[PDB]
UniProtKB/Swiss-Prot annotation, chain B:
Protein name according to UniProt: Dynamin-1-like protein
Tissue spec: Ubiquitously expressed with highest levels found in skeletal muscles, heart, kidney and brain. Isoform 1 is brain-specific. Isoform 2 and isoform 3 are predominantly expressed in testis and skeletal muscles respectively. Isoform 4 is weakly expressed in brain, heart and kidney. Isoform 5 is dominantly expressed in liver, heart and kidney. Isoform 6 is expressed in neurons.
Family: Belongs to the TRAFAC class dynamin-like GTPase superfamily. Dynamin/Fzo/YdjA family.
Reported modifications of this chain: Phosphorylation/dephosphorylation events on two sites near the GED domain regulate mitochondrial fission. Dephosphorylated on this site by PPP3CA which promotes mitochondrial fission. Dephosphorylated by PGAM5. Sumoylated on various lysine residues within the B domain, probably by MUL1. Sumoylation positively regulates mitochondrial fission. Desumoylated by SENP5 during G2/M transition of mitosis. Appears to be linked to its catalytic activity.
Comment block on domains: The GED domain folds back to interact, in cis, with the GTP-binding domain and middle domain, and interacts, in trans, with the GED domains of other DNM1L molecules, and is thus critical for activating GTPase activity and for DNM1L dimerization.
Source species, domain of life: Eukaryota
Described function: Functions in mitochondrial and peroxisomal division. Mediates membrane fission through oligomerization into membrane-associated tubular structures that wrap around the scission site to constrict and sever the mitochondrial membrane through a GTP hydrolysis-dependent mechanism. The specific recruitment at scission sites is mediated by membrane receptors like MFF, MIEF1 and MIEF2 for mitochondrial membranes.
Cellular location(s): Cytoplasm, Cytosol; Golgi apparatus; Endomembrane system; Mitochondrion outer membrane
Organism: Homo sapiens (Human)
Length: 51, 46
């Protein structure tokens, strides 16, 4: 019966138009505050000195 | 004479008492150098 997308290709939709796009919206530079990162890498060094 | 030698014995006893103490210190001194490397040392640059 011709109707709303369901059953089969609706899941295809879920795995592309929904899911694929959803992931495309994520970050890739999200959370990357330069200054906070500079702090983070200072923390990564820790108690020692670094070259 | 008996006193004389007794004196000597006591002296070396004292020396032996303080021996291992210094040994421990020297051991520690090396360990301290092993404990940490200062790459910010004033004479160390590259």
């Amino acid at each position: 019966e011709t109707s709303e997308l369901c059953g089969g290709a609706r899941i295809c939709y879920i795995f592309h138009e929904t899911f694929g796009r959803t992931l495309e919206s994520v970050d890739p530079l999200g959370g990357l505050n330069t200054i906070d990162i500079l702090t983070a890498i200072r923390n990564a060094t820790g108690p020692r000195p670094a070259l | 004479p008996k006193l004389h030698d007794a004196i000597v014995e006591v002296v070396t006893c004292l020396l032996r008492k303080r021996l291992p103490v210094t040994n421990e210190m020297v051991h520690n001194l090396v360990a301290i150098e092993l404990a940490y490397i200062n790459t910010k040392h004033p004479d160390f640059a590259d």
